[PDB]
RNA sequence: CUCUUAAGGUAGCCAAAUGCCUCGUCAUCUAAUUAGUGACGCGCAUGAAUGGAUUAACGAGAUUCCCACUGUCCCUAUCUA
RNA sequence: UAUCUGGUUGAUCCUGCCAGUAGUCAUAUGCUUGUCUCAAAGAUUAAGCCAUGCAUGUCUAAGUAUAAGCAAUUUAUACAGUGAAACUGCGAAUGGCUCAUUAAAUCAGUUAUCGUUUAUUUGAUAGUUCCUUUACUACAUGGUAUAACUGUGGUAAUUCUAGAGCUAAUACAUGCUUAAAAUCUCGACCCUUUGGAAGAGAUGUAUUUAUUAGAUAAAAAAUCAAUGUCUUCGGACUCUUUGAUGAUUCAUAAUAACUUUUCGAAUCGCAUGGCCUUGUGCUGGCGAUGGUUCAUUCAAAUUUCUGCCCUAUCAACUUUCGAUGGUAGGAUAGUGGCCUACCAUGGUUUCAACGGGUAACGGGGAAUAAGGGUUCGAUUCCGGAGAGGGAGCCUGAGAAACGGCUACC
RNA sequence: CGCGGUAAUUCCAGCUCCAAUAGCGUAUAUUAAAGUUGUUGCAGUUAAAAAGCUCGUAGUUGAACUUUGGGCCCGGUUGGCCGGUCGGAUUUCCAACGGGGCCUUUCCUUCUGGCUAACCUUGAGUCCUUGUGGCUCUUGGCGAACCAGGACUUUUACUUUGAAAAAAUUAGAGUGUUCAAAGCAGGCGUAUUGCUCGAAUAUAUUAGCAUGGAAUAAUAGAAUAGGAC
RNA sequence: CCGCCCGUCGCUAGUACCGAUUGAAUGGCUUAGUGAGGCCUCAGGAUCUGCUUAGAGAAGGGGGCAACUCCAUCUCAGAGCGGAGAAUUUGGACAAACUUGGUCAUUUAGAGGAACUAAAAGUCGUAACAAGGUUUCCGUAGGUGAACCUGCGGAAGGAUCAU
RNA sequence: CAAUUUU
């Protein structure tokens, strides 16, 4: 739900306890914090040279992924700064000895360092509750559909 | 509150309720032994029909398991031990073959007539 | 609801106490735990469940008040004091010095030791880090925290301690080839001594465990607890010897060891 | 008491939770402080587990940094300027977190030009020892000291006003001057 | 079957603007109602383009009830042209 | 102990039901009644009403006692006992009862707290408190403010209380010292310097911020700017620490400061010591408490995954009276629409949302028994809720307590 | 279902008999019987029932084929062996077998570090009857028989094992509560101040948690090569 | 077939259904308004207080004829600085309780109307069962004391498996 | 072609 040099709103947005000295002026001009995630997860490359602040970020912000890890697929990116994903799963019933599909879908906050669409096979991670419904955050997209920058016409 | 006491009734009446060739096979069996009522000839046939209900599911099991081995040669040890099944039927299927008068020969009132000693089963 | 429930009743008990149900009442609730959870052991169950000296509850109450029965050098002069892992129990005159270890089936023992070896515990160290005033602190099985340890023991080892001062004497490592005395699970405490371990990272971690009976079985990491290297053992080893030999042959050897 | 759990408050799908468990004590929030100015009228509640929290209205004095290192000079607060969340507290003089305060800015250029004594820009044996040792340092920035002419400067808050009973912020730095000097200044 | 002088009130409707007997009888509305309403019908004497039965909108049409509002009343006083 | 019989016709073979059969921790009821051994018992509807009598207090040697009791000793001549009270401390939040409400709600398993607070049990842990930091003024030991009690009262009653007389402490409230080194800002002075140095002092911890540190692959150097321990001075070249995670701004240390200052003994019982510098010289043991932090337990709070009978003669449900997110703040013990300001227009749904019913507390579990089931489970255990109906409450670690309180019906 | 309309084998009694029996009928709600609810397992011409017919998203179900056949070695279990031995015996091979690793055109994940571990490395000494058969310091010498790191393996269903699934109740071993329901204890020595076994075991659905297989049911990248070392 | 069966009407009993009453009661949530009580909070300050008392109501001294504004003794005094603190009290939230409007569900009263079932004793007929004597049945429209009849398009479940 | 009952 943002673009355009992400400092946007009625407060200034900056990471807490972070201080580059304004009297010091070297050739890097960056003191931007990040971390490693855990779980054998790499951190993505744009999450080091990002510009977003947004504390609800999984990598640059303040969460720690420590819960039940799931996997699903996206039904909408039309929801702003957070994504709802669909999980389909079977359910055996003992009486009729046959399976039945019931589902349950999950909303999940995402880093702005990812750009996803409907479809887009995705896994998430369970975090401390960022909002009312959502208790999850994305970790890696890996949207290995067809035509990874292929078609000419 | 203190614990539940656990207790079970120990007899189950037959399901066709009464007919001639069932009742006459009672009265000659339960009359020459001369027993009290049908409460006891049911209750030995109750646990007779439950140990065969136990036995023919480990008989469904194969050997070299635990259960057909371990308790399987323990109740057939115990059926030797109770004096009912004689010392030649350690074969795991003849327990299914025994029937009445063999759970009756090893009670008191029948066995004490067999040593003399009682002159009848009703003096016994 | 509203505060801590101090009354539990029997037929809710940690069944390895082996309490019947015709007395069947409000159970002996342990005190606040010195060491670990409600897998512990109160005093006034032990004196009249297997040790079988106490008869009335007022009579075992008339034992521990006079500073009679001693634990870890101390006395612990209140009634339902819990008992940790491999706890030493110093007795009075006639000198029946005891020790709790657990059998092949999770139950305890009827175990007695001498005053030799009865001066040290083996504590599952689990949280070693440095605290304020710069001191590295260490924790034990009983929480008997000890100042200024040997740095780099590791996490998740066991240590030989003093029980008069803090002063751990000899630590031990934890690698491929030890001897392990696990507790927790259906199959606690045979010995496994190692065969393998892996990463399994985050969820749990597993230790593959194999006694002289040479079957191997897998147990989560928080239950494993070494008491030495290959062929070490530190303690007076009990008479069931930690095998859990199988269901048929124990009946078959009791058919033999009664000497018919 | 006002509750904090979600046993009320219509759920995700829109289904009403017909409520059970009328409200307890362990989830209790309470009426705000909504602090003021006016020299140290503080009370003290006692709460969960045995604990102190200081209700703070009419505070008077904070401490504010460079923030090159964190000097924390003793400083009285003066007023309230601008706030991100709402225009509630500008014309009621409440100072919250992430607020903007003018403080006094008089002991700072006092300190900055007595401990240095530059003196920009509107002797003894030790200033030749210890001040002269700290030469070539006092170059700071224009628009952080161009407000050191009229007498007073801005600051922000980064401590909790109403809970901790304190007010410990810092004066702004660098680009965060240039942001809030674009926020409130687009007025006339 | 039956007789006047030809065939004998069908579908509907009502004490209705048609019913003297009448303030018919029953239930509801109000403390009290010969006024209303909704039912009954062997209707002195209802009724099928002398049109019967309904019906949204509308009416300076007739009528009963309820809510607000008031000198219509208790119970009158005062002021102005 | 995987089973069937009578009845549609003058007779037949069927679909098909009715009735008979058996069991029920499945309840009453009729008749009858010798023996032991253990026990369900006002759930069914009226979670409707209650007379009365009880159900929660407590003390050691180790808090306070001039009982104006009884001890009655031998010292306990201030007194040590047994102490009636009464203050002080912990308990009363667990138990025991019931099932009214309550259909992704509780609850069963399953995770998590790097998103939190702890009364105690255990384990360790404060020489620095003085700013008058030299009229600290007493620490070889301070102050008041009071109970039972005395003697005076009212009202008819209630665990109703008043004015007057003293009085206590582990109650309130102050209060100074313990050895000791050492690091650092500042600087008596003189002498001009690589400027040295007396000494003004800060230096225990907590609360609040701001800041820094919290390492790492393959190994050595060149040029310039201040430019060295030794000093052949173009020369030997830097010595240097890392906890722990799968993952942190974590634990921790130091800065520069702040705090109606939080913290560090004005307490009691037995034995009566050691040493001569024979005197409150000085040491001088063990209990019984109690306090700062950090872990263990007891906990308590949220908390992700799946599972919840019947109805489409309930197809759309939600959003200015928060619906769904973001940001910022408050408030909490603690994340979060938990509440507010602003901005955006979303979220569930024929894999059955939403609404309605439930003689619906959920589960472990019962009764039935070839296999697959069906119907129960208010109730001997676990967990949730309630103490006429709702609502708010001070104390306390822990109550939205109801054998606690205030208000309305 | 029918009995009773001047002898009722069904009514009311008296005798006799049948039944269960210290219990026995009745009343209501239930489960089996009921294959009269049906997945396992109904019926649909005439007994109740097949839409008047045709589209149609759901949802369910969907042609086939994508590595076989081997040979060699190694040890593993059970029944046998003149039985050699006195239900114990079994070296040897047979049978029934299953498992691993190779060569089969051959997936035999990519490496970083010390351990690896060994001569094929290697001077040979050989303390020895065979001259790395019994051992030694051993060079580019097999690089991991092991921990902790980079690395990223189309994604599941299924199924094996293990963990978990509070405990009592249901099973089930043991145990003469005099027997049994039950309990979980007891049992024996010198009775000269004691020895000792126990308080088993199994089920506990589904959802997870690791763990092998790749047939079975789907799934994806090299058509414009922005393919692959 | 001297079979069986079909309706209307007459009596006897009972079942729900629809009903005027801008019906009623309980409950759910709501619709606008009313606001108790206990909280936080602006005040409030009665009633207790502390260091300091210039002077003295009181009387005794830093020693002395009084030789100095001091111990002397209570508060008339200046109040300087404060503290504890009861009633009262402003503003916010929680809102019990209450009123008015809806909507939904649950029960329930109601003069009368219109069915339906049962017992066979009936009174008019005989449509159905034979080709039931006019073949029979299904839709549909109209009449009809009553079953019924008749018009149309079907079908055989028939009274024809055939030119 | 007339034709309808019969406990």
From Swiss-Prot, chain A:
Q: Which UniProt keywords apply?
A: Acetylation, Cytoplasm, Isopeptide bond, Ribonucleoprotein, Ribosomal protein, RNA-binding, rRNA-binding, Ubl conjugation
Q: Which GO terms describe its cellular component?
A: 90S preribosome; cytosol; cytosolic small ribosomal subunit
In which compartments does the protein localize?
Cytoplasm
Per the record, residues carrying N-acetylserine are: 1
> Cross-link Glycyl lysine isopeptide (Lys-Gly) (interchain with G-Cter in ubiquitin) - where?
14, 45, 55-56, 78, 95, 104, 132, 140, 147
Q: What is its main location?
A: cytoplasm
Please, one GO biological process term? maturation of SSU-rRNA from tricistronic rRNA transcript (SSU-rRNA, 5.8S rRNA, LSU-rRNA)
Briefly state the modifications made to the protein after translation.
N-terminally acetylated by acetyltransferase NatA.
What the entry lists under PROSITE patterns is as follows: RIBOSOMAL_S17
User: Is Ribosomal protein given among the entry's keywords?
Assistant: yes
Gene Ontology MF terms: rRNA binding; structural constituent of ribosome
Q: Could you tell me which CDD domains the record lists for this protein?
A: Ribosomal_uS17 (cd00364)
Please give the superkingdom of this protein's source: Eukaryota
* Other comments on record: There are 2 genes for uS17 in yeast.
Q: Which family does it belong to?
A: Belongs to the universal ribosomal protein uS17 family.
Q: Subunit structure of this entry? A: Component of the small ribosomal subunit (SSU). Mature yeast ribosomes consist of a small (40S) and a large (60S) subunit. The 40S small subunit contains 1 molecule of ribosomal RNA (18S rRNA) and 33 different proteins (encoded by 57 genes). The large 60S subunit contains 3 rRNA molecules (25S, 5.8S and 5S rRNA) and 46 different proteins (encoded by 81 genes).
User: Which NCBIfam families does this one have?
Assistant: PRK08572.1, uS17_arch
Write down what this protein is called.
Small ribosomal subunit protein uS17A
The organism named in the record is Saccharomyces cerevisiae (strain ATCC 204508 / S288c) (Baker's yeast)
Q: What is the lineage of its organism?
A: Eukaryota, Fungi, Dikarya, Ascomycota, Saccharomycotina
From the UniProt record, report the name of the gene that encodes this protein. RPS11A
From Swiss-Prot, chain B:
For this UniProt entry, the molecular function terms from Gene Ontology, in alphabetical order, are: rRNA binding; structural constituent of ribosome
**Does rRNA processing show up as a keyword for this record?**
yes
Q: Where is it mostly found?
A: cytoplasm
Question: Any idea which UniProt keywords this protein has?
Answer: Cytoplasm, Isopeptide bond, Nucleus, Phosphoprotein, Ribonucleoprotein, Ribosomal protein, Ribosome biogenesis, RNA-binding, rRNA processing, rRNA-binding, Ubl conjugation
User: Which GO biological process annotations does it have?
Assistant: maturation of SSU-rRNA from tricistronic rRNA transcript (SSU-rRNA, 5.8S rRNA, LSU-rRNA); ribosomal small subunit biogenesis; translation
Subcellular location, record wording: Cytoplasm; Nucleus, Nucleolus
Which GO terms of the cellular component aspect does the record hold? 90S preribosome; cytoplasm; cytosol; cytosolic small ribosomal subunit; nucleolus; nucleoplasm; small-subunit processome
The record's comment on protein family reads: Belongs to the universal ribosomal protein uS4 family.
State the protein's purpose. Component of the ribosome, a large ribonucleoprotein complex responsible for the synthesis of proteins in the cell. The small ribosomal subunit (SSU) binds messenger RNAs (mRNAs) and translates the encoded message by selecting cognate aminoacyl-transfer RNA (tRNA) molecules. The large subunit (LSU) contains the ribosomal catalytic site termed the peptidyl transferase center (PTC), which catalyzes the formation of peptide bonds, thereby polymerizing the amino acids delivered by tRNAs into a polypeptide chain.
Tell me more from the record: Present with 106000 molecules/cell in log phase SD medium.
- Name by which UniProt lists this protein: Small ribosomal subunit protein uS4A
UniProtKB/Swiss-Prot annotation, chain C:
Every S4 RNA-binding domain range: 41-104
Q: Which InterPro entries match?
A: KOW, Rib_uL2_dom2, Ribosomal_eS4, Ribosomal_eS4_C, Ribosomal_eS4_central_region, Ribosomal_eS4_central_sf, Ribosomal_eS4_KOW, Ribosomal_eS4_N
The UniProt record lists the keyword Ribosomal protein: yes
The keyword Ribosomal protein belongs to this UniProt entry's keyword annotation = yes
Phosphoserine-modified residues are 31, 246
UniProt-recorded Gene Ontology molecular function terms: RNA binding; rRNA binding; structural constituent of ribosome
User: What keywords would UniProt list here?
Assistant: Cytoplasm, Isopeptide bond, Phosphoprotein, Ribonucleoprotein, Ribosomal protein, RNA-binding, rRNA-binding, Ubl conjugation
UniProt record, GO biological process: cytoplasmic translation; translation
**Positions of crosslink type Glycyl lysine isopeptide (Lys-Gly) (interchain with G-Cter in ubiquitin):** 61, 133, 160, 167, 173, 178, 210, 232
Matching Pfam families: 40S_S4_C, KOW, Ribosomal_S4e, RS4NT, S4
Q: Where in the cell is it found?
A: Cytoplasm
List modified residues, type Phosphothreonine.
114
Q: What does this protein do?
A: Component of the ribosome, a large ribonucleoprotein complex responsible for the synthesis of proteins in the cell. The small ribosomal subunit (SSU) binds messenger RNAs (mRNAs) and translates the encoded message by selecting cognate aminoacyl-transfer RNA (tRNA) molecules. The large subunit (LSU) contains the ribosomal catalytic site termed the peptidyl transferase center (PTC), which catalyzes the formation of peptide bonds, thereby polymerizing the amino acids delivered by tRNAs into a polypeptide chain.
Family to which this protein belongs: Belongs to the eukaryotic ribosomal protein eS4 family.
Name of this chain's protein = Small ribosomal subunit protein eS4A
Write down the species: Saccharomyces cerevisiae (strain ATCC 204508 / S288c)
From Swiss-Prot, chain D:
Task: Please share what else the UniProt entry notes about this protein.
Answer: Present with 15900 molecules/cell in log phase SD medium.
Region (Disordered) residue ranges read: 1-30
Name the UniProt record assigns to this protein: Small ribosomal subunit protein eS8A
Q: Which residues carry this modification: Phosphoserine?
A: 65, 68, 72, 85, 142-143, 146, 149
Q: Which PROSITE patterns does the entry mention? A: RIBOSOMAL_S8E
Please give the chief subcellular localization of this protein: cytoplasm
Its Gene Ontology biological processes?
maturation of SSU-rRNA from tricistronic rRNA transcript (SSU-rRNA, 5.8S rRNA, LSU-rRNA); translation
Whether Oxidoreductase counts among this entry's keywords is no
| Domain of life per record | Eukaryota
State the family it belongs to.
Belongs to the eukaryotic ribosomal protein eS8 family.
Alphabetical keyword list: Cytoplasm, Phosphoprotein, Ribonucleoprotein, Ribosomal protein
**Keyword Cytoplasm: yes or no?**
yes
Gene giving rise to this polypeptide: RPS8A
Q: What does UniProt give as GO cellular component?
A: 90S preribosome; cytosol; cytosolic small ribosomal subunit
Phosphothreonine occurs at: 61, 106
Q: Which GO terms describe its molecular function?
A: structural constituent of ribosome
Summary of subunit composition and partner proteins: Component of the small ribosomal subunit (SSU). Mature yeast ribosomes consist of a small (40S) and a large (60S) subunit. The 40S small subunit contains 1 molecule of ribosomal RNA (18S rRNA) and 33 different proteins (encoded by 57 genes). The large 60S subunit contains 3 rRNA molecules (25S, 5.8S and 5S rRNA) and 46 different proteins (encoded by 81 genes).
Cellular localization per UniProt: Cytoplasm
Q: Which organism is it from?
A: Saccharomyces cerevisiae (strain ATCC 204508 / S288c) (Baker's yeast)
